[PDB]
């Protein structure tokens, strides 16, 4: 019963960026990422591939696993919400390095190549596209807050925190505001990495959740809540 | 209780990782990989594009780590592209580093099973149909197929029957690997989905539909 618009042709949604603070988006912060390089050539320190070297460094190799970050970013970036252009990923390395992930990027799915990207990114501080038009991965200055939208809700994943329905929270949250999630890619540790930034911590399920599963779990609720399909 | 192929009455979410690209080669037996073994596979003449087992690893990781599996309502099956069918005990916990997963698979394929002291990973005889529950609904993931809500879909189906989803871990190819067994094909998301993402999406609906939490 309604006349159709002037132009029905689907257009690619603008790619969200840190400069833009008005648009609603779902921010995910992969805190405590274990991404470190060392000359042997520079190689991403790995939990299994390198054991003696990290012992020489004195770092507990249990918290030396970047594959968790690789899978979490893989499950994130491939999510439909990215394909709808409503998500931005931020990575906070355990050392204190903050990395902005352009939604357009595509990490290699193979872990070995992923390590090659990380060492390239950490040393050059930036990654350029094949077509050479945009910097997909860029290291950015801390604190995280300045990059986040002016009006934004901050939350972390806490197993001890009350178990919630991710879908329900997103509808009752206001529209112009955005939601920022801090996810611990650590294999184990105390969930206080983002306490100083966050305002309230939530648990997603009664049972323990993997970081990749929780990241995938959270985005699905937003897509259901925002009708992203 | 831990769900098994012998028990058919119980409701469960069955996922079949069809066209799985797992293969062992000796120069000692090692799982073939797109990156680790290129010149060797070039000498085979097979394209390295279809030499990528990590999709099965990632998909099995997300499926195994999902709340539904922890709730004892999910069983995983893997149909290798060579024609090998593998049953995955829900109790298992695979290695998450890909290298240790590959060493497990070569152990699984050559010894035909894994025992750690029930059989964690066991190679089973084809076809899949005999193993699956007696009353069960079968679907595949097809991009061209109509988009359907996984929550609404599972709700509208009956309770005694079980659900099979046939997911293609394969890199490229026509979505006809499981046409013979399946009765209809459904679309999960409006956009193209990776196998792991679609598996992550589907178990979300079952968890919401069944109130697994």
């Amino acid at each position: 019963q309604k006349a159709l618009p002037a132009s029905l042709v689907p257009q690619a949604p603008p790619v969200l960026t840190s400069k833009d603070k008005i648009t609603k988006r779902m921010i995910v912060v992969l805190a405590m990422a274990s991404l470190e390089t060392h000359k042997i050539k520079y190689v991403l320190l790995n939990c299994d591939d390198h054991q003696g070297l990290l012992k020489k460094m004195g770092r507990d190799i249990s918290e030396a696993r970047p594959d968790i970050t690789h899978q979490c970013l893989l499950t994130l970036l491939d999510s439909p919400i990215n394909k709808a252009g409503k998500l931005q990923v931020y990575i906070q390395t355990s050392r204190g390095i903050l990395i902005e992930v352009n939604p357009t990027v595509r990490i290699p799915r193979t872990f070995k190549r992923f390590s090659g990207l990380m060492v390239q990114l950490l040393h050059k501080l930036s990654i350029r596209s094949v077509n050479s038009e945009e910097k997909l991965l860029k290291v950015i200055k801390n604190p995280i807050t300045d990059h986040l939208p002016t009006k934004c809700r901050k939350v972390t994943l806490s197993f001890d925190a009350p178990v919630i329905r991710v879908q329900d929270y997103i509808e009752k949250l206001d529209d112009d505001e955005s939601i920022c999630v801090f996810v611990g890619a650590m294999a184990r540790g105390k969930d206080n990495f983002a306490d100083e930034y966050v305002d309230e911590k939530v648990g997603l399920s009664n049972y323990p959740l993997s970081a990749s599963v929780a990241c995938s779990k959270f985005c699905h609720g937003a897509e259901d809540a925002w009708n992203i399909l | 209780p831990v769900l098994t192929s012998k028990d058919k009455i119980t409701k469960r979410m069955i996922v079949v990782l069809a066209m799985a690209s797992l293969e062992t080669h000796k120069i000692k037996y090692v799982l073939l990989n797109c990156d680790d073994h290129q010149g060797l596979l070039k000498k085979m003449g097979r394209d390295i594009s279809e030499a990528r087992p990590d999709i099965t690893h990632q998909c099995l990781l997300t499926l195994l780590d999902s709340p539904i599996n922890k709730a004892g309502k999910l069983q995983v099956y893997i149909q290798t592209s060579r024609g090998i069918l593998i049953e995955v005990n829900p109790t298992v916990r695979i290695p998450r580093t890909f290298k240790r997963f590959s060493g497990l698979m070569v152990q699984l394929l050559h010894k035909l099973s894994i025992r750690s002291v029930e059989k964690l990973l066991k190679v089973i005889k084809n076809p899949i149909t005999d193993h699956l529950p007696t009353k069960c609904r079968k679907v595949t993931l097809s991009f061209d197929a109509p988009v359907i809500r996984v929550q609404d879909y599972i709700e509208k189906l009956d309770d005694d029957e079980s659900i099979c989803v046939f997911v293609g871990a394969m890199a490229r190819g026509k979505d006809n690997f499981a046409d013979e067994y399946v009765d209809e094909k459904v679309g999960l998301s409006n956009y193209p989905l990776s196998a792991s993402v679609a598996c992550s999406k589907f178990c979300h609906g079952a968890e919401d539909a069944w109130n697994i939490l």
Binding site: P108, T110 | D35, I55, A171, P192, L193, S194
Partner: peptide, 11 residues
């Protein structure tokens, strides 16, 4: 255009 589960090209 790459789609779904494609890996970036390796040279």
């Amino acid at each position: 255009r790459f789609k779904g589960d494609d890996d970036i090209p390796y040279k």
